Amino acid sequence: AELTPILPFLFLGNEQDAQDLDTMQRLNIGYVINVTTHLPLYHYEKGLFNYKRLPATDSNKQNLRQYFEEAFEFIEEAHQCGKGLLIHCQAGVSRSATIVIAYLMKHTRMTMTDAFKFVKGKRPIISPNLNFMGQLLEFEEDLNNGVT
Numbered sequence: 001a002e003l004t005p006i007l008p009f010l011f012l013g014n015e016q017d018a019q020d021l022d023t024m025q026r027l028n029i030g031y032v033i034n035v036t037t038h039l040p041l042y043h044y045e046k047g048l049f050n051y052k053r054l055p056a057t058d059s060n061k062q063n064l065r066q067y068f069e070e071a072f073e074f075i076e077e078a079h080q081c082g083k084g085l086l087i088h089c090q091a092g093v094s095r096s097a098t099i100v101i102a103y104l105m106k107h108t109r110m111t112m113t114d115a116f117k118f119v120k121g122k123r124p125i126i127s128p129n130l131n132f133m134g135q136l137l138e139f140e141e142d143l144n145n146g147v148t
């Protein structure tokens with residue numbers, strides 16, 4: 001049950017990783033982003049975590065760029081209060097890895113490929129999907145022609 005730490009307060013996992021409550025609390029995670037339409041918000045009724053759903057499919061037509069800003073705000077909310085945030089989807093982590101990489105590109109000032117190489121080093125099994133990759137490329141330009 002690996003919850004891959006990407007930053008000290010930002011973790012990435014699949015559907016089975018998000019179900020390990022005892023590891024969540026050990027790592028002081030109080031925020032969860034569920035990047036699926038169909039999975040439950042694990043541990044919702046327990047009243048322990050703040051939740052956000054990005055209702056996205058792992059398809060070639062899914063727009064994830066629309067969710068970047070909303071997701072970055074939830075990450076910084078956890079960061080500013082000293083709590084960890086878990087972002088997960090399913091096996092292959094295609095959706096959640098895209099959002100994690102996008103965050104690193106904006107607030108770590110890495111390039112698209114540098115962020116991808118950084119994440120792959122920590123979670124070696126990332127399933128590819130060219131549609132999300134193209135959205136990250138467009139995202140890189142919007143960054144390079146803006147502030148921070």
Ligand SMILES: CSc1scc2c1-c1nc(SCC(=O)C(C)(C)C)ncc1CC2
Pocket residue numbers: 093094095097098101112113116126127128129130132133136
């Ligand atoms: C931003 S990805 C990137 S940049 C340069 C390369 C790649 C890459 N990525 C992947 S898997 C990750 C993905 O496709 C996501 C679902 C997170 C968008 N497989 C192969 C390659 C080839 C080289």
